[model samples]
Target: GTILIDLSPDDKEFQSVEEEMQSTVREHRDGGHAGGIFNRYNILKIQKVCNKKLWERYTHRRKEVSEENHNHANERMLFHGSPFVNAIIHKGFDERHAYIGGMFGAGIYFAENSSKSNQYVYGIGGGTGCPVHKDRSCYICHRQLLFCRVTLGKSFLQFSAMAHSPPGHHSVTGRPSVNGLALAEYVIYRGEQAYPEYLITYQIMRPE
Candidate 1:
């Protein structure tokens, strides 16, 4: 199940979030304060939402292609949209794809919330999938998964620049690739609006 919410880019909440992100990024770029914006809790919150929403979109797209080809009736019939998407793309391992995913990373990060007792308790779209594992039966397969542990020195621009500029190679497969979000399941979920107020922000940039 996905946490469903309405996260329109034009919505006031998201607009506020975007504004905060931009302001934070500017602070990092100008003042050389590379501290993260969101804390680990909030970062994971966005990550979970983005991942769920992305996955749902992937399945939907798959259903569409199957229908267009008229190849598999069951495949087309199986297509369903998740509630997660009301909140948050891509392929070919291209630079553009990597940039988008990286932007989600570069602009979205977490830091300690001094005001909160539990550093990990932040509001997310309820009913969302938990990253923890329960059993073998509950396992999900993603084509590729990467977890990045970042150090606290580089500017958002520095990281974002790296996201697209250099076409890095995969360490395991040695395939030529860019930092990107490839095809997958799950995506963002904007829901009935029940979440906490944490440090929120935005980053506005024109990629080269």
Candidate 2:
């Protein structure tokens, strides 16, 4: 079974993620980025998903980590902006589908700052074929971002591309490399280690 929680501004949960986007975008506004301090994107909707099996997998993974590693539930909320998020939000993240050579590694990636995630607002090749591009709705922001809860119990830090998950590490990340990880983009090797909790639909301003 599945549960889709479509929330409005009245819901505190909706308010929380909404504020996060604004704050993240505001904080990362630098070097005259358009979407940063100046041209802001308005969130169209904040929808949460609950898939029985997928969520149970995340829970089982959590139980394993907390027991085997004796670590706290150091899970965190992360953001990912992409069209593919729509395809896999109901299922789960598959690193195999994540285009390899991620500058950091071949794993699912997420960001703390909306500005960084916002860079992926447009992409190609979702799960499969969709209708023509013309059929796409013309909403205010017509873009999408995902706010997720990642199970990052122990993260291995790196600064280069890696094709596989490091030994005994639940996730991988960097120390703000100016080239890519300047915003601490995270790379999770396993699919179930992350959950796409909230799918954020928004509008992005054109460069013109």
Candidate 3:
């Protein structure tokens, strides 16, 4: 396993980073303000320990090339070996508590700022000055489709064009409904079924 550490100071080091991270998160008083890198300062610090594998290797020799090789080699060693341990404790902070809050905050920020905008809904490239840009638009151009019955009416207004025609059209060509069924099948196949849940539990009930 790897450990990542945040060496940043909360009051001083993270203030700038917090501002940028916080702006991206949304506030719902019930959920509190969410989504930001603010709380992740410490968790990411722990993440850093894993991210960098800071304790797994030390300088056996001090040459620059040797240092680079040692660093890369140590990381590879992490991939294959064990006995490497990561430890860090900041003064006056509950390492665990800070980590929990930070993780949730980071998750909030990601959901609000990253996931929604990335799901580009329409021709709207996102609101002006909004940080995200959508790569594509959704079908039906994000509109409510008009529905009408063809069997009951001789009225010309009874039928209207649809981006995807109604179910069971007996046209010489395949109906949009059938195509939609195929499309539905494709969508089902495309989806990797998952029961998405947030599970964050730290197993630190015993003394280490």
Candidate 4:
């Protein structure tokens, strides 16, 4: 089984990321700060992903591609929403199993905005349907989102869709909204370039 380290309710990291997610929804909500959208979400659980396999792969790739760039070498935290958190728990973020919506490239997609990825888990365009259900208990009534460490390295910006990363770049990012997306989207080709560090389970109540 994969290592899933549950964070105590008082864990500083949990408190931090949880607040970030909630405030993020308010700052960049879909409606009038307000309509066919939501402005509130409650994080129910956060599990620190401690897969040795993913850690090794990510560390090796992180240093290999990012050291030269230095600045982004520390990597960036990004969000990916999905119901299949268990899949990543086992095999890691395999780009092979990733689906489209990649306007930047046919690669793994991540976002700086939690709401952006939340759309994916909410079944807006995810095609997977809603992950939460009323029948479930409070602990189980939630969808999942991954807070990942992404080694952007030399992530070159593109104004339009690209099939792959630029020759000198390790990843691709798009202009906010201008990239045919509402928020900045990043695409990384190598699975090891991104590690699922935290898995957050949250519940959202549609704004009335």
Q: Please give the range of 10 consecutive residues that has the lowest summed lDDT in model 3.
A: 183-192
Of 3 and 4, the candidate ranking higher by lDDT: 4
Model 1 CA deviation exceeding 4 Å by range: 27-109, 112-204
- Candidate 4 residues lying further than 4 Å off, grouped into runs, are 26-36, 68-74, 122-124, 131-141, 160-163, 177-183
User: Which TM-score value belongs to model 2?
Assistant: 0.79
User: Which of the numbered candidates is closest to the native, going by highest TM-score?
Assistant: 4
Per-residue C-alpha lDDT of model 4 across residues 1-208, encoded as one tens digit per residue: 4788899989899998887677655334334221115567767798898878778989998888866776457478888876456787689877653545556657778887787777666433545344344222122346788888898888888765314568888988876643333556788887888888888987766556
Better of 2 and 4 by lDDT: 4
Per-candidate TM-scores read 0.19, 0.79, 0.19, 0.81
- Greater lDDT among 2 and 3 belongs to 2
Write the number of the candidate with greater TM-score, choosing between 3 and 4: 4
| Cα displacement (Å) at residue 5, model 4 | 1.5
lDDT by residue (15-119, candidate 2, tens digit) is 988888877663342443322223466678889888989898888888776675685657889987665776677668775446476766677888888867765
lDDT of 1 by residue, 162-193 (tens): 12112221011111133232111111111110
lDDT of each: 0.23, 0.69, 0.18, 0.70
Q: List the lowest-lDDT window of 10 residues for candidate 2.
A: 127-136
Q: Which stretches of candidate 3 lie over 4 Å from their true place?
A: 10-13, 28-49, 52-109, 112-208
Sort the candidates on TM-score, descending order: 4, 2, 1, 3
Give a tens-digit lDDT track for model 3, residues 1-208: 4422444545453454333322432322222111111211121221122222222122221122233443331110100000111111111111221112221121101122211222221212222211233213221122110000011111011111101112221111111242221110000000011111111111101112
